[model samples]
Target: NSIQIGGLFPRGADQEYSAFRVGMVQFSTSEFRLTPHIDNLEVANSFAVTNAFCSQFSRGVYAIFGFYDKKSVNTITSFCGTLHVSFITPSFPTDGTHPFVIQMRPDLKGALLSLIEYYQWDKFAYLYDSDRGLSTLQAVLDSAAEKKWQVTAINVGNINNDKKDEMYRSLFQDLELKKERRVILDCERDKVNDIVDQVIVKGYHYIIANLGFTDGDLLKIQFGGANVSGFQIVDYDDSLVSKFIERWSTLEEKEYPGAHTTTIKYTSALTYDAVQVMTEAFRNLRKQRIEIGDCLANPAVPWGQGVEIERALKQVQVEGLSGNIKFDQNGKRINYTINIMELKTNGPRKIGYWSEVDKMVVT
Candidate 1:
């Protein structure tokens, strides 16, 4: 009477997994209770990710929630495609479309591009942290020549992603030498503070390229009187969000670290949405019962109903933490909204929003 689902994450991703559990608690019914088989590893380790993935496959999971780097994501993509188990993830969509993979995160390329265009910025610096960050910038640079925009891209990522405080100071010194003030930071949430703390001037402005504006720890980042802007998917003003936070805050503190934070992060909300999305798909499943084989079999036998589950997952649409939950035939999130937020002296304020139907709706 229990439906087993796989959860894959990096070791430090406690918030996401906690949200996953919270969703299970809220949504579970007598007909089907979700049992999560979680595997936490360094995500980038191809062999370890595969080993963990296979472990779940043998457990007979019909679906998985996953996140992986560019190098190792292909392994999950290939395995999910071959094994027929749908992968529901908040991770960025891969460049090439693969079957049975559900992308929960709306593609940020359009929002980022449209935001720059709205600001009418023709020249700036792009400071990125990883290859994943660079991938988004790839689409940006493609438009540079067409728009005649001048861009100077510099990598703020260091080896093993360390030496933060000392590293950003020197990087800022170099930027000051070039007399640059407008810069876009596309780095990890924590790295934002590391780099921003090194700001040497008062007039500089920044556009954060990622969608983590309300990520709790980010609130602690003093923008240092520098104009800062970013996009956020969750609107804290919504009654639905407040109701969720009310219920979410009552969760046991020890079981879910950071569960009681004043603001729910986009990452945690996405995970909750991912769970809700999968539940509907699982509930709607009829004759197509869960049947899976060993992932490491000499010749693997893919699940017969895996494609059916994937199709159902793509068809689900529900209102959740991220405002809208919908996908196209390719299992890519569609018809979503991204709120444009700016840092004010008091707090972050939403000035406008971005959507496909209307490119940018500024106040």
Candidate 2:
């Protein structure tokens, strides 16, 4: 029999889900028909995700492929662990992991520290948005402590109200007063945009600790020749990426939430790669003669082969749209390459790349 996987996409994340579906079509084989039970979720609240999870559970879904909000990660993790359902996502690293949760995105701490070392900054300010940013923030703080680097870590409020704006402004004012020019923005994409507007006004050379897609916003701004650097997980130069972008360009505008442009986002690429990973995992399972037992009868108990499938997924190593697809013991992506990009007058170009095997290479 074929495998039925679940996809819990956010209400407005049409592009991400669309890419997931593309993976389903590209990877499905005669050995196993990949069935997707996609459900558009609205809120990140535990209740909303739990409702969706229950719906999938009733359908005898062995695994789930979807996006989970920062606030809902813990709840989803708990549910997946308890039910022994493999939950895979390309979302940002949630730091610690659960037995059943496979993080498709690599943790940013390693790349962040590598970038910091490449710059050789003796002092800098780290502006973070939410608790999810704490791991990378702490990694920097720890490195600074050992190296005796001056560090000012601040938590920027995420609310859109006037108070939050004032807080962000105050952060800039303090950094300006202290004559701190080197800064690391480790916040959400939108927050990066808001903060960049303020920092660019002050003529500060900052390194954004986010994906390349979000960096587009900063690239649009006139930097006045100030240096702006960031890391990208996806290599736009790869042929796989080139072909994916060509297909994405043909997608209908109404099919996805955001406007389709020539560029393919990191999230969309990861979504596609995630499906491939799952497909390969199932293929391996079939080779090993492992059966994904039916859980519809006893919804309380997880599928017997869930752990085995997860193990197979962790062992999966292939060339994906986002580079090498691999995972560590904790199910976090590892042995991957992150392109080092810098915004220039022309556009963002790859200056080099960072990898687990090689710390940083300036190309």
Candidate 3:
């Protein structure tokens, strides 16, 4: 009667789960209803993801959608490929190519490059959480070295690890001593708030290389006429977004913790859009008379119509809350616009936009 799907997220990710449930409600249609069986996994446990996915597969899901961190990405991708089930995600950027995986969020490296040029940052401090964080900024790091821009790169380590306060203070002192004002922070979402608190105390200008979801901490800080810039995928000013919020505001406060905000996080918006994308795909699949089968036992053989459904997903083009929703041949989101936001006297304002077609435009 209804198409069953799978969703996976970290156990304690209240925002992700809340947004996901909202999406399920909004996109459910009479002709093609989606019944998502969601599983919450432990952050450090790949086995948890594997077991959850297998359990969902056994239940005969047409597709799956949810957030997957770097640790569990390979597991999900491999599993999806083997079963030929499409896996769409807002989190987890691939290495440009991965079978049966669709990335809902645009890559940050291009946005990072544009922001650096826009600010004309001749010298800056690059604070990263891990060695992996360095890879995200590899292109800019390479250019900075070649162009002779002064760059002080430092690994702040894990903020939750031992001596986190000491590490943050030490980094702050180092930046002060060096008189480095321009900075680029590349860290996890949870660590951004703590890292920026120390930076603000020192009154330094910085640009965040992460998405809007990670910028919640930055949103709280009163810049006091200082420059703070970041990129946002979700444009809250869109009429569609406004209506979504209008409906979201009516929901119970206890159910949706942060849904009452005027601005929805990129993760939440993507989770919602992922559902819309799948809904469009499933509707189109029905038009084509494609049948999605259950791979309960012989998942190794793969599904015959799963690839067709994936093709439908790729063919789907919807202007969702996150702007243009389209995928390239590799299942990566392309031809989408990301808003360049700057903290002002009131709050974050959309000063401009960046897209693959139009490099950057100041609004």
The Cα local distance difference test for each model comes to 0.83, 0.78, 0.78
lDDT by residue for model 1 (1-363), tens:
788899998899888888988899888888788888888898888999899989999888878998888668889899999988899998877667789899888888889889889888988888887655456778879988889998887777663446666676677776787788888888877667767776746677789887778678686746458888898888878887889988778877799976876677788889999999988888777435644267777787888878888888998989988988899888888899999999887878999999987889987
Model 3, residue 151: distance off in Å is: 2.3
Candidate 3 regions with alpha-carbon error over 4 angstroms: 131-134, 200-203, 213-217, 223-225, 293-299
Best-first order by lDDT: 1, 2, 3
| TM-score of candidate 2 versus the correct structure, residues matched by position | 0.91
Clash number for model 1? 0
Give a tens-digit lDDT track for model 2, residues 1-363.
778889988887766777787788888876677888888886467788888887897788878987777778877788788778888898777767578888888777787788888888888998887644466777888898898999998887456557876777788788988999898888767777677666644456688887663324546764465778887877767888777778766777776544366665678778889999999998988898876633334556766777787798889999998788888878888888888887677777888988888888999
Cα-based lDDT at residue 113, candidate 2: 88
lDDT of candidate 2 at residue 222, scale 0 to 100: 49
Clashing pairs for predicted structure model 1, backbone only: none
Which ten contiguous residues of candidate 3 have the minimum total lDDT? 213-222
Please give the RMSD to the true structure for each candidate, in Å. 2.3, 2.7, 2.6
For candidate 3, what is the lDDT?
Answer: 0.78
Question: Which residue window of length 10 is worst by lDDT in model 2?
Answer: 291-300
